[PDB]
């Protein structure tokens, strides 16, 4: 089967690794970030590797409503189908419960809650035309657990889970799978930069984080691909509405 | 201890029981509705049943950020401190995962979800002047199960449980206290109106909606009101951060 994924924020980190495993594996790509030179560095790796593959680059912001409907129309006009859909997008800035307020909060709720919510209305469009489609939203632990420094992040978090669920419930009879996939501590840009956020106060920092992850480490962005590949295989056409950590054991709680 | 209360959405439903049952209990209090003479009939139901209590009328639209402020400062003004919050808004327009749109979902986002935690902001500043909080957030039960009818306000019952949470944290060092009440199925204008809301295909509606609910009846508003007014009580001190329904058994899952 030649089955077609889309993968976005895939210029680095963990929707590279997603990127270069779906490719391992065969798949035909469309691949996304906003800076063009660096996703197209992308499709070079992938094509070097697998001279082979069809590989295709939509560079722009999917946190932009008429980009987000000018990415799908391309893929849609270019591919003809889409089977597995990455929802993969960065949370907003960092806030608490006492500096947020209603601007930026409006602005982090439409970049990537509403950005995943309405990615998944387009491909699932699209998806319903072959009765097949696997959806991996990338999100994270903090829906469950909260969130001191990421107030708002984590409020979105659960937001993004509970629609999840309830799209999944409404797109299980057209055989598309709708999962939620949250990386815990994983060795990204976006981690070492925390590794700093946090060193506010005092490299030995990560010996702390360490700390709390009963795997006693952090995690790499293909262990997390690991988990997404699978989800967007065709064997995993019984498992939908999940809420699947990647996180060393980092949850207490049942 | 001549504790204060400030009850928005009072007008009618869960919120106005909720002002009876502080005001049976002995609280100054604040209430809160947009139509200036249902909010005052309720002052005068009040007084008409206890002549030497204390009730304050602020109309206003409690989802308008300005009008917030603005109720706030005549709070503080006019009562000199604030001990008990009962966040009582209404959910947005019903949606669904296939006409959610962002303007709308904005809209709701704003009008519930930001109105609370903002709410909640104003009066901890109040609160932290006298070491004493009570904060019970009128949330719903659509936050863990959702919800096909209900696709934004679900996810955005998720969220404010999330944040309550969050805060619940934050806040407990100051003896203030943040709880979500989950209402189920009770009977209010909101209610009489799903019986109808639903009755698209056929009153025996009701028959049918009481069948999933294990108490096999719908609750009342004071029913709820009880449970709201226990967690305002000085004697629930140690108890924070908690989600309780009051929904007849109608939560299936633990
Ligand atoms: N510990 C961790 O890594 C955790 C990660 N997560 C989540 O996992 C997801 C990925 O995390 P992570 O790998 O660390 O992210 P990174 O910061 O490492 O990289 C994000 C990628 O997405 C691209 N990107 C950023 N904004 C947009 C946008 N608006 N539109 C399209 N592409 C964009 C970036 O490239 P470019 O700038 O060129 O656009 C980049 O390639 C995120 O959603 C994050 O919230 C959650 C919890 C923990
Ligand atoms: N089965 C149920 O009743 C359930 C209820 N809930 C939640 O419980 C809460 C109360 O529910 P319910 O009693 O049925 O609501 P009702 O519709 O019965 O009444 C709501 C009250 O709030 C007032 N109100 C509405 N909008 C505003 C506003 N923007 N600012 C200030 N006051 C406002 C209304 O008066 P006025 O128009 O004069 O302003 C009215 O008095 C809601 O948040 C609802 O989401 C959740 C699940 C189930």
Redesign the interface.
């Given at each position: 089967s030649k089955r077609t994924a889309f993968v976005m924020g895939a210029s680095q980190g963990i929707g590279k690794a997603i990127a270069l495993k779906l490719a391992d594996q065969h798949f035909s790509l469309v691949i996304n970030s906003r800076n063009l030179d660096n996703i197209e560095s992308v499709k070079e790796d992938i094509l070097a590797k697998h001279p082979e593959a069809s590989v295709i680059v939509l560079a722009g912001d999917m946190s932009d409503?008429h980009t987000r409907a000018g990415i799908f129309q391309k893929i849609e006009s270019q591919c003809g189908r889409l089977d597995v859909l990455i929802n993969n997008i960065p949370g907003g800035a960092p806030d608490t419960?006492?500096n947020?307020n209603?601007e930026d909060?409006?602005a982090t709720?439409?970049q990537k809650?509403?950005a995943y919510?309405?990615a998944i209305?387009r491909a699932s469009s699209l998806m319903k035309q072959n009765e097949f489609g696997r959806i991996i939203n990338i999100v994270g632990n903090l829906?469950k657990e909260?969130?001191?420094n990421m107030?708002t992040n984590?409020?979105?978090?659960?937001?993004?889970?509970?629609?999840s669920?309830?799209?999944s419930?409404?797109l299980a009879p057209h055989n598309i799978t709708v999962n939620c996939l949250n990386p815990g501590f994983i060795a990204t840009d976006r981690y070492h930069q925390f590794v700093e956020n946090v060193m506010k106060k005092n490299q030995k920092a990560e010996e702390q984080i360490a700390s709390g992850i009963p795997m006693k480490r952090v995690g790499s962005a293909e262990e997390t691909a690991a988990l997404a590949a699978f989800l967007a295989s065709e064997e995993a056409s019984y498992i939908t509405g999940q809420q699947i950590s990647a996180d060393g054991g980092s949850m207490k709680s049942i």
């Open positions: 409503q419960f006492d947020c209603i909060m409006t709720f439409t809650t509403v919510i309405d209305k829906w909260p969130g001191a107030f984590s409020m979105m978090n659960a937001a993004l889970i509970n629609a669920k309830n799209i419930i409404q």
